């Protein structure tokens, strides 16, 4: 058996679901942190199935932790610690958002609150961003190879070039984004991520910059199920990704599954 799997067994409602089987409370981490701006702490209070896995979760250009904050609940209650950070300064730029989100995990592991280290696998850590941060997802893969997961929101970076990324990512893009265009971000960074990497591209039909930061039930349900398949390796939620999802509210969606 996989002793990573948390949770009942999972269906279209579950991981579309508001809320999932665990209940979540936080811990808020200040500012005087080292590395990064401090964040709430988002984690399952159930500990009789075991550990979790982590993901750290980075605001974009001149945004705070608030913009993030609806992925704490929904995701935690999935099996997760959720960490939405503030970044040191909002002028951060995406090489920053990438060892800030690493600075982030390292709190987490090393120096967080007894109530959520007890509750940590330290081993299966993984990053997420909005933007410039979803940016610093793809550069904190660089600099840590070791991530389970990557997930770069409507990402934004002047670096186009990702060849050597070997941590399984998943790319939300919005199809009129006009700050951070599919076609000049996204889609580069998804092309040049090597074609033998387990990855995704989903674009959003009709959806602007911000949608990240608005609940959106298509980003939520999948977002569930990469960290599922990644940090979990749980292959019970490979049935949501390959074959790859045909929701209404998509206008791409391609991928190199299988995910073997
Ligand atoms: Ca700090
Ligand atoms: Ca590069
Ligand atoms: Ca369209």
């Given at each position: 058996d996989n002793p990573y799997e948390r949770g009942p067994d999972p269906t279209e409602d579950s991981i579309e679901?508001?809320?999932?089987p665990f209940s979540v409370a936080t811990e808020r981490v200040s500012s005087f942190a080292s590395g990064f701006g401090g964040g709430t702490i988002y984690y399952p209070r159930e500990t009789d199935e075991g550990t979790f896995g982590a993901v750290a979760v980075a605001p974009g250009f001149t945004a705070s932790q608030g913009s993030m904050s609806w992925y704490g609940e929904r995701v935690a209650s999935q099996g997760f610690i959720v960490f939405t950070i503030d970044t040191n300064t909002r002028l951060d730029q995406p090489g920053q958002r990438g060892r800030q989100l690493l600075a982030a995990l390292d709190y987490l592991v090393e120096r967080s609150d007894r109530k959520v280290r007890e509750r940590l696998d330290p081993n299966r850590l993984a990053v997420m961003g909005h933007a410039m941060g979803g940016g610093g997802s793809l550069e904190a893969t660089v600099m840590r190879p070791s991530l389970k997961a990557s997930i770069p929101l409507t990402p934004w970076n002047?670096?186009?070039?990702?060849?050597q990324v070997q941590v399984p990512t998943f790319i939300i893009g919005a199809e009129l984004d006009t700050i951070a265009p599919v076609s000049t971000h996204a889609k580069p960074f998804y092309e040049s991520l090597p074609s033998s990497l387990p990855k995704a591209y989903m674009e959003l039909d009709g959806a602007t910059h911000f949608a990240p930061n608005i609940p959106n039930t298509t980003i939520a349900k999948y977002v569930i199920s990469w960290l599922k398949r990644f940090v979990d390796e749980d292959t019970r939620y490979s049935q949501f990704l390959c074959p790859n999802p045909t929701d209404r509210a998509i206008e791409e969606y391609r991928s190199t599954c299988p995910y073997k």
């Open positions: 679901a508001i809320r999932g002047l670096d186009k070039t990702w060849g």
